[PDB]
Design a protein around this ligand. Structure first.
Ligand SMILES: O=C(Cn1nnc2ccccc21)N(Cc1cccc(Cl)c1)c1ccc(-c2cnc[nH]2)cc1
Ligand SMILES: O=C(Cn1nnc2ccccc21)N(Cc1cccc(Cl)c1)c1ccc(-c2cnc[nH]2)cc1
Lengths: 299, 303
């Protein structure tokens, strides 16, 4: 049972390099529009305290240099949507997949294609944390890298990378340019809200551990939904809803372990710890697999 | 510090499905040849005790269905090379990347593009265990999925999936059809030998920890490679080769920590444990990042 990302090919065909002055980052080229973080228009001094509408009005189309591989794309128009810059180019991307822009919920997962200078480096799976940060693998130059899910040949873009917080976690926006969380695109120190653990995901992963033959953490106790939620909140776990219980249904049916019986296992795990043991190779409780991620990989 | 697969687009454009009789599996289309596991020609009952040479003699080109999506590629030649079947097709793949076939060492990592009916489903990073199994994520119908590394847009293919073992680990061949490990393509009970920890990768991970400022485990001693190898084997760790010392060279130079000093620090961790401390947030020593994986993720290496 591994962390599994979607194949990246359809997104690879869309990655380009956007340059404004001496600032360079990645852009997403779909049809005849290139999307990228708007802080590409900032000098390093601008970034310290930018007024974006003021900075953008002073830019011309020729200030923007878009490179796809070794081809230069000509910018023929530019506008700004929230924190995203939209460059109209004179060429349509022949590799544009069927796509959608979506805003994901805390606790949902997505694949990230990490890119530098418009070229792909690696792909990995991430979750939107409850505090709206992501635990990414991004170096300097990765801004504009995107997160996505793929369903029946359609790419749903959900994340564009903008920054790294002082703690090393990452923040960004949806494809409409709205940050996830209370962050802003100004280079100043920003703390995130206190993070919590994605409970429905931990339960899914515990089910994955049972499907793969590991039952050491199970027990006989039972719990009610409310009583489990009392303990969950005490340990900074997100509440479990009745829809979460229903979503876990297929995993409950496959294993013959009622959802609330798995909650009693997790409650014992939180109150007693793991006693040096491991689950699915991990010594910590993993919360970045959703029930769907488990179902897709286990079936 | 998290696992990172290679971008999979160059391999996605090479995946096809191969059907013989009622058996469908994945194939790899490069130029005008499709490579796939030879057990596609077996029935499920044949698998119990196959004679591949006899099963192949009764096959003709017109018995093989190769499809790119739903589009048939006409087979115009066939042959068997070890445990892989090579089907010559009448169309050269225009998506063929620059590529090589390589045979990897235990401990080395690769990305696997898990596929079902020729359709890519997911990508993840895998290590070849010292017992020549991989702890992959494969369901039925994933046979023929390949593992690969990328180096400046040359794809090095290193693994083709053939089978699941009773313990749930996976076994396969290189692109020339030679199994990794003492396994065979017959459904007879086979078992993986006892596994060990990949020492060179644990050392790579300790170097990654030092790079990020987590260095409480650096001790004051050194060791010789021979002395270390004899001790490590008592803890079910692999011995180091001369190639292992050399591939740790760049991390040793970047951190200023001699390889044999890091071996001495690891030895102390084995003999005394962690004392409830963590490394890179982990209470366990990670052994599925190679030295190359550490550098690839710490630099912005693109392809
Ligand atoms: O963190 C990043 C960029 N970044 N992203 N991932 C990273 C991983 C490692 C290192 C840096 C990373 N920041 C800081 C920042 C702080 C608060 C808010 C924001 Cl939006 C950015 C940044 C973004 C733009 C510029 C820039 C634009 N023109 C000139 N200079 C300079 C710095
Ligand atoms: O394990 C697998 C295949 N497999 N691989 N990953 C898997 C993940 C989930 C489920 C199955 C998986 N085996 C059993 C086997 C035992 C020892 C050696 C070998 Cl080679 C195979 C197999 C291989 C071919 C056939 C077959 C050929 N024609 C028609 N049916 C039938 C069974």
């Amino acid at each position: 049972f591994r962390k599994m990302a979607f194949p990246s090919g359809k997104v690879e065909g869309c990655m380009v390099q956007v340059t404004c002055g001496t600032t360079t980052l990645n852009g997403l080229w779909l049809d005849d529009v290139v999307y990228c973080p708007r802080h590409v228009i900032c000098t390093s001094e601008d970034m310290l305290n930018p007024n974006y509408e003021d900075l953008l009005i002073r830019k011309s189309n020729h200030n923007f240099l878009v490179q796809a591989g070794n081809v230069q794309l000509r910018v023929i128009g530019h506008s700004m949507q929230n924190c995203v810059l939209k460059l109209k180019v004179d060429t349509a991307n022949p590799k544009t997949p069927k796509y959608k822009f979506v805003r994901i919920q805390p606790g949902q997962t997505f694949s990230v294609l990490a890119c530098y200078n418009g070229s792909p480096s690696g792909v990995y799976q991430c979750a939107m944390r409850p505090n709206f940060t992501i635990k990414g693998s991004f170096l300097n130059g990765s801004c504009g890298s995107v997160g996505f899910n793929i369903d029946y040949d359609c790419v749903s873009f959900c994340y564009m990378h903008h920054m790294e917080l002082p703690t090393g976690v990452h923040a960004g926006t949806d494809l409409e340019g709205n940050f996830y969380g209370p962050f802003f695109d100004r280079q100043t120190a920003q703390a995130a809200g206190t993070d919590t653990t994605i409970t429905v995901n931990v339960l899914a992963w515990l089910y994955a551990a049972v499907i793969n033959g590991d039952r050491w953490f199970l027990n006989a106790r039972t719990t009610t939904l409310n009583d489990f939620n009392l303990v969950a909140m005490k340990y900074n776990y997100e509440p479990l809803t009745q829809d979460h219980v229903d979503i876990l249904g297929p995993l409950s049916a496959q294993t013959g372990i009622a959802v609330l019986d798995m909650c009693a296992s997790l409650k014992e795990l939180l109150q007693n710890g793991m006693n040096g043991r491991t689950i699915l190779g991990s010594a910590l409780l993993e919360d970045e697999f959703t029930p769907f991620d488990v179902v897709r990989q286990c079936s």
